[PDB]
Amino acid sequence: HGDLHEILHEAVPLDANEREILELKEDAFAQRRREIETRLRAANGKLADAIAKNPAWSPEVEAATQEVERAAGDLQRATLVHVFECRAGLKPEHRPAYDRVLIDALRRGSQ
Amino acid sequence: HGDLHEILHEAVPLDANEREILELKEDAFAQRRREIETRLRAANGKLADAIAKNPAWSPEVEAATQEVERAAGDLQRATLVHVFECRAGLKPEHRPAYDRVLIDALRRGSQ
Numbered sequence: 001h002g003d004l005h006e007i008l009h010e011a012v013p014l015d016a017n018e019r020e021i022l023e024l025k026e027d028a029f030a031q032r033r034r035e036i037e038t039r040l041r042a043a044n045g046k047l048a049d050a051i052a053k054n055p056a057w058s059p060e061v062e063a064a065t066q067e068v069e070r071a072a073g074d075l076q077r078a079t080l081v082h083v084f085e086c087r088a089g090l091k092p093e094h095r096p097a098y099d100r101v102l103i104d105a106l107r108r109g110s111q
Numbered sequence: 112h113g114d115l116h117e118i119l120h121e122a123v124p125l126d127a128n129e130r131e132i133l134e135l136k137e138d139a140f141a142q143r144r145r146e147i148e149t150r151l152r153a154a155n156g157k158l159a160d161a162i163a164k165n166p167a168w169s170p171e172v173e174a175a176t177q178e179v180e181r182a183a184g185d186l187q188r189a190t191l192v193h194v195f196e197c198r199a200g201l202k203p204e205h206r207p208a209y210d211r212v213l214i215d216a217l218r219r220g221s222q
């Protein structure tokens with residue numbers, strides 16, 4: 001359950017050019033992450049509400065679980081695409097440490 | 112990212128009869144959880160390995176993400192079914208506190 005994005009930002013320094021050329025992509029990702037997180041929080045609330053009314057694996061509960069999964073999946077994908085687009089801006093020599101952090105975090109289940 | 116099952120076990124005391132009549136279900140769920148967790152760890156490793164070879168949203172990476180999602184989803188469902196089967200063994204008077212803990216944890220995204 002680690003925060004893959006935060007892990008990478010904290011663990012892998014960028015050089016001056018790298019920081020500058022990725023600023024716009026970081027801003028766009030922050031906005032996209034917030035939008036999807038709003039959907040995920042709402043979906044979690046709908047699952048909670050469904051179960052509050054009848055705790056059972058019912059059609060309502062099943063559909064609410066799918067909405068949670070879709071929002072979490074959209075966030076996971078958007079996060080990976082952003083990780084990959086950052087990698088493209090890195091100098092080639094700087095990719096091995098970025099990759100190490102990425103791969104290790106994925107292996108532990110971070111998203 | 113809270114552990115829904117652990118939250119419920121720690122926060123909601125059971126009476127003597129409740130504890131006794133749920134022991135077999137707890138054992139079965141522990142075994143099922145471990146089996147699915149083994150699959151999830153393996154799937155996380157395969158996603159890490161795929162990205163190690165080419166960090167890109169490629170067919171291999173996409174398929175590995177789906178395997179992670181399927182294992183996580185199987186675990187989420189098995190966990191909820193077990194939560195519901197425990198609820199059935201509770202005395203009716205004991206369900207409101209169980210439900211409170213369940214609903215609050217779901218609202219925060221625990222699974």
Ligand code: NI
Pocket residue numbers: 005009026029082086
């Ligand atoms: Ni970033």
Ligand code: NI
Pocket residue numbers: 116120137140193197
């Ligand atoms: Ni249990």
